[PDB]
Amino acid sequence: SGFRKMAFPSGKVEGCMVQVTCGTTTLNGLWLDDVVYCPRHVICTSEDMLNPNYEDLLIRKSNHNFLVQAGNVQLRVIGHSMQNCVLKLKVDTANPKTPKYKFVRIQPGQTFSVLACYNGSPSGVYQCAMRPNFTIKGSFLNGSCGSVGFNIDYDCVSFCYMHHMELPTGVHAGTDLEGNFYGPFVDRQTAQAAGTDTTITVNVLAWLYAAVINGDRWFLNRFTTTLNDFNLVAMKYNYEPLTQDHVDILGPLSAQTGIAVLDMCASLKELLQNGMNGRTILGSALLEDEFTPFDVVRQCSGVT
Amino acid sequence: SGFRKMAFPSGKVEGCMVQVTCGTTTLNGLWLDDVVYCPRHVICTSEDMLNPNYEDLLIRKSNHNFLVQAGNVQLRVIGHSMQNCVLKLKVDTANPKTPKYKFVRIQPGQTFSVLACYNGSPSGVYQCAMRPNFTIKGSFLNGSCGSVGFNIDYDCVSFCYMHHMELPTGVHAGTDLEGNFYGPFVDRQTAQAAGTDTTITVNVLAWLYAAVINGDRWFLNRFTTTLNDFNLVAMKYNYEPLTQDHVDILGPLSAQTGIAVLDMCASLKELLQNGMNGRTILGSALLEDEFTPFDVVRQCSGVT
Ligand SMILES: N#Cc1cncc(CC(=O)Nc2cccnc2)c1
Ligand SMILES: N#Cc1cncc(CC(=O)Nc2cccnc2)c1
């Protein structure tokens, strides 16, 4: 019993964190096999960040200008290349702690764990979600760039995010491990505004199922609805539209609790229209949307 | 920017998790040096749990009855002893991944990270606090016993909790690493009720300071108060009394923000009396109390 915002154990990723310094800029790198991945803005001075031409800035850099340190020991850089917004620094030593891994590009609404680092050293781990506007609400200070987001399936780490930027509003933007930003963001110190941060409806429903499994049932009502009726209310409350694919994904939770997905939608619809009335669900006074249906099943079944 | 419920990186603790089986009961153990620590209720059948006499049950157990497995390899048990509610199994091999460590007994209000495990395998990490009634609100299923709570100061892990029990209300109870329960709980399948779960006032104030540092300032008001006036309102709302020791501990946050501690108390007093009015602070609709002043400083300064 109990339901917590839970991150994956971070050990496998801690073994990959390195410090990358170029000139006077220091950030984090991810060392997998004999390649260190890091945000390409490591080559920029704060002045260059205003309007950088990365290809031009990279011409003035050689392998020896990239300083990579793993723990208190230096790695030898024998090659470097830019792939989209990340630099790949080939080193002469394969990371002995390289876990089994994949690079994945996640969809909005998907959750992942972040190992926040400074100077190639891990400081903390937290769970978050790719927002529908392709930002993430993280906890990152100057020096955190290159910190990564990941999910783990038994022994294989799927890396899905690398931190690059803080928008003027204090929300975060980054890339997948191929260097492509999530959303329309660019690695430039220019004002970029995020779109509407809508609520991830399928995740709220999964979390309402987690609440029922854990004894929080006060919000269950005597109504049902349809996908079209629910979605009219969802649009009004800036919730993402629910599709039959989302209903399918909630099937295991529906089966476990005996609550039809559309009945849970009707409970959610009344919570949107009536509010919580000072009550809480799983210790929260608002509807939580950073647990996917897969996360609820995993946490409630104890997947290791 | 951004403020997250952040756990310590769990790698150092992942390297200590083992599976302990006695008869038909399997739970988690913590392997430090040549000792494996685990809840003494590993020797109980579900029937024994109703009214166990641990000393009597232990007479029927020998070293070879305790099966300890680290990864997919078996450890040889060469000694066993009971210390309060934990068993200490001496093994013939010192854990090669033993980090620098201490055993600490925390006070209510203190926070720590939990590495939730099943069959000696880590499944997740989350942050929580020792409640003022000496329970913890965790996320633990059958098989999670022996999962541990810890804090890390640079490279030294201070273990403060080991999971033992779920109360009939779904809240959790456990011991320090010397086997002494936090609070009045006992390792017996008998109905035990928790006392009032009051709000950790000094932590709410620390989190209001974190909110100001991150731009959430709407709740700042034009008032101040005194410790005695604030505490009259705190008692009424089931908040822990604030002492001058708490005011002292909030000094660094007061200095950083320029908001006197008593002025922040007056903002908190108005939030208690007026409510949030549908507003949020750091993405929360209720006042968060599982961040200590030390956690706020650490997260806001990027301690690794
Ligand atoms: N890419 C990119 C980029 C562009 N302009 C500026 C930066 C620096 C930056 O965003 N800093 C920081 C600070 C706190 C949290 N996260 C990131 C990065
Ligand atoms: N000590 C002790 C004890 C006493 N009676 C019963 C138990 C078993 C128990 O509490 N199970 C469990 C299940 C889910 C989360 N946490 C713990 C343990």
Curated annotation (Swiss-Prot), chains A, B:
Active site, per annotation: H41, C145
Query: Where does the record put the Glycyl lysine isopeptide (Lys-Gly) (interchain with G-Cter in ubiquitin) cross-link?
Result: K5, K90
Places the protein is found: Host cytoplasm; Host Golgi apparatus; Host nucleus
Q: Which domain of life is it from?
A: Viruses
Activation/inhibition comment: Inhibited by pyridone-containing alpha-ketoamides compounds 13a and 13b. In turn, alpha-ketoamide 13b (tert-butyl (1-((S)-1-(((S)-4-(benzylamino)-3,4-dioxo-1-((S)-2-oxopyrrolidin-3-yl)butan-2-yl)amino)-3-cyclopropyl-1-oxopropan-2-yl)-2-oxo-1,2-dihydropyridin-3-yl)carbamate) inhibits SARS-CoV-2 replication in human lung cells. Inhibited ex vivo by michael acceptor inhibitor N3. Inhibited ex vivo by compound 11a and 11b.
Catalysed reactions, as listed in the record: TSAVLQ-|-SGFRK-NH2 and SGVTFQ-|-GKFKK the two peptides corresponding to the two self-cleavage sites of the SARS 3C-like proteinase are the two most reactive peptide substrates. The enzyme exhibits a strong preference for substrates containing Gln at P1 position and Leu at P2 position
Q: Which residues lie on this side of the membrane: Cytoplasmic?
A: 1-304
Domain annotation Peptidase C30: ranges: 1-304
Q: Please describe the quaternary structure of this protein.
A: 3CL-PRO exists as monomer and homodimer. Only the homodimer shows catalytic activity. Interacts with host FBXO22; this interaction promotes the proteasomal degradation of nsp5.
According to its UniProt entry, the function of this protein is described as:
Cleaves the C-terminus of replicase polyprotein at 11 sites. Recognizes substrates containing the core sequence [ILMVF]-Q-|-[SGACN]. Cleaves and inactivates human TRMT1, preventing tRNA guanine(26)-dimethylation of tRNAs. May cleave human NLRP1 in lung epithelial cells, thereby activating the NLRP1 inflammasome pathway. May cleave human GSDMD, triggering alternative GSDME-mediated epithelial cell death upon activation of the NLRP1 inflammasome, which may enhance the release interleukins 1B, 6, 16 and 18. Also able to bind an ADP-ribose-1''-phosphate (ADRP).
Record protein name field: 3C-like proteinase nsp5
In its UniProt entry, the species of origin is given as Severe acute respiratory syndrome coronavirus 2 (2019-nCoV)
User: Could you read off the lineage of the organism from its UniProt record?
Assistant: Viruses, Riboviria, Orthornavirae, Pisuviricota, Pisoniviricetes
Q: Which gene encodes it?
A: rep
